[PDB]
Design a protein around this ligand. Structure first.
Ligand code: HEM
Ligand SMILES: NS(=O)(=O)NCCNc1nonc1/C(=N/O)Nc1ccc(F)c(Br)c1
Length: 370
């Protein structure tokens, strides 16, 4: 189908953690980024790799892991240590397989949300549940970067939203088959799961430290689109002749908030303003199956139209509980961007907050009763 798992939602079910032995020189660099970066051997070990054919990768999970491996190497190669000493050219022996692999997975050749979160995890013990304490990340950039906390908490917000996403078939079939009671329970279960996803979101304080995120990790997730340090983008040597620009990572790339915008008929990506264009641009950084899923929902009959047309105050309350849990998520998110970015910035990015406030505002405008 749309590669949406019932238990983990948009996340890659049970990611592969090991590559064929043919790729150990890739794997060795990725597993050792904190040391190799700290000493300054990282760029040297990248520039000495042979060119490895990607054709020994033979399933979606092996290719997803290879993309995560090459994507971490690329960020560590471009940004190095984080203090302005960048590289504007990606060596051929990594750029070519990376770009080839990315074309096959239909992703931009830059680290995205779906690599470093949705494929970058493992259970400690496969027979115990998906709790923080039973999980680990597969790669990190620097000692102290809080990558495990940041990646795993984002992942756990995705798994919470999965119990909501599981209900979306029920919504459209209760509409088609005119089943009012069924549609009302469905919307109320969605709001319930959206409310639990927000409480899982509070665990970002438990595991991520603002100074670590702002001054270490944020750097390795940054991109080269409208970035003054790489004003023309990145040359992917041996693959494209001219430098290319791509945006850095963001859970704007998470389909979960865009999922429920489309479902509830909230008019985010409709218009020509800068908030709509960004949200549609971020859809090019999502896995193709998830891109197609969001478009498939966009073409179905409106859930908002249905509830608005049937003079049914219980239905309207259920829809509003959904819009409200969405508004709560984005407001808490505003808070998070204040604690983890704006405050540490002071120790131009005011278009950041104007974007997020416009999206939250548009969301709360869809409420049926103020
Ligand atoms: C330290 C933690 C986080 C920070 C600092 C942060 C920051 C940001 C920033 C700066 C943007 C603007 C997009 C851009 O300029 O690239 C953004 C957008 C977004 N973020 Fe986060 N984020 C964090 C965690 C999360 C988590 C855990 C989620 C949900 C799983 C999330 C969901 C979203 C979404 C959906 C958008 C797009 C705007 C919208 O749909 O309302 N973020 N975030
Ligand atoms: N250079 S900048 O302004 O600070 N970049 C801001 C873009 N937002 C983010 N930066 O860093 N994580 C971001 C973000 N926002 O929702 N979510 C986020 C969460 C987990 C991930 F693995 C990735 Br990749 C992105």
């Amino acid at each position: 189908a749309y590669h949406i798992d019932e238990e983990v939602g948009f996340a890659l079910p049970n990611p592969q953690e090991n590559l064929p032995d043919f790729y150990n020189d890739w794997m060795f660099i990725a597993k050792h980024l904190p040391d190799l970066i700290e000493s300054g051997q990282l760029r040297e070990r990248v520039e000495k790799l042979n060119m490895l054919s990607i054709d020994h990768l033979t399933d979606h999970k092996s290719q997803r892991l290879a993309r995560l491996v090459l994507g971490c190497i690329t960020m560590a190669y471009v940004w190095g240590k984080g203090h302005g000493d960048v590289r504007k050219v990606l060596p051929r022996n990594i750029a070519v397989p990376y770009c080839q692999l990315s074309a096959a997975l239909e992703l931009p050749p830059i680290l995205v949300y779906a690599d470093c979160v949705l494929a970058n995890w493992k259970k400690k013990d496969p027979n115990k549940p998906l709790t923080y304490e039973n999980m680990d990340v597969l790669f990190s950039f620097r000692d102290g970067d809080c990558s495990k906390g940041f990646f795993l908490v984002s992942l756990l917000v995705e798994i919470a939203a999965a119990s909501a996403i599981k209900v979306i078939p029920t919504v459209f079939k209760a509409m088609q088959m005119q089943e009012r009671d069924t549609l009302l329970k469905a919307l109320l279960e969605i709001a319930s799961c959206l409310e639990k996803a927000l409480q899982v979101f509070h665990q970002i304080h438990d595991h991520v430290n603002p100074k670590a995120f702002f001054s270490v990790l944020r750097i390795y997730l940054s991109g080269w689109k409208g970035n003054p340090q790489l004003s023309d983008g990145l040359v992917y040597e041996g693959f494209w002749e001219d430098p290319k620009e791509f945006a850095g990572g963001s859970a704007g790339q998470s389909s979960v908030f865009q999922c429920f915008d489309v479902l509830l008929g909230i008019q985010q990506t409709a218009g020509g303003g800068h908030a709509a264009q960004f949200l549609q641009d971020m859809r090019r950084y999502m896995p193709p199956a998830h891109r197609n899923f969001l478009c498939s929902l966009e073409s179905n009959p409106s859930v908002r139209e249905f509830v608005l047309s049937k003079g049914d105050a219980g239905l309207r309350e259920a829809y509003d509980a959904c819009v409200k849990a969405l508004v709560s998520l984005r407001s808490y998110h505003l808070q998070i961007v204040t604690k983890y970015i704006l405050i540490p910035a002071s120790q131009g990015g005011t278009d950041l907050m104007n974007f997020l406030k416009t999206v939250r505002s548009t969301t709360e405008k869809s409420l049926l009763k103020e």
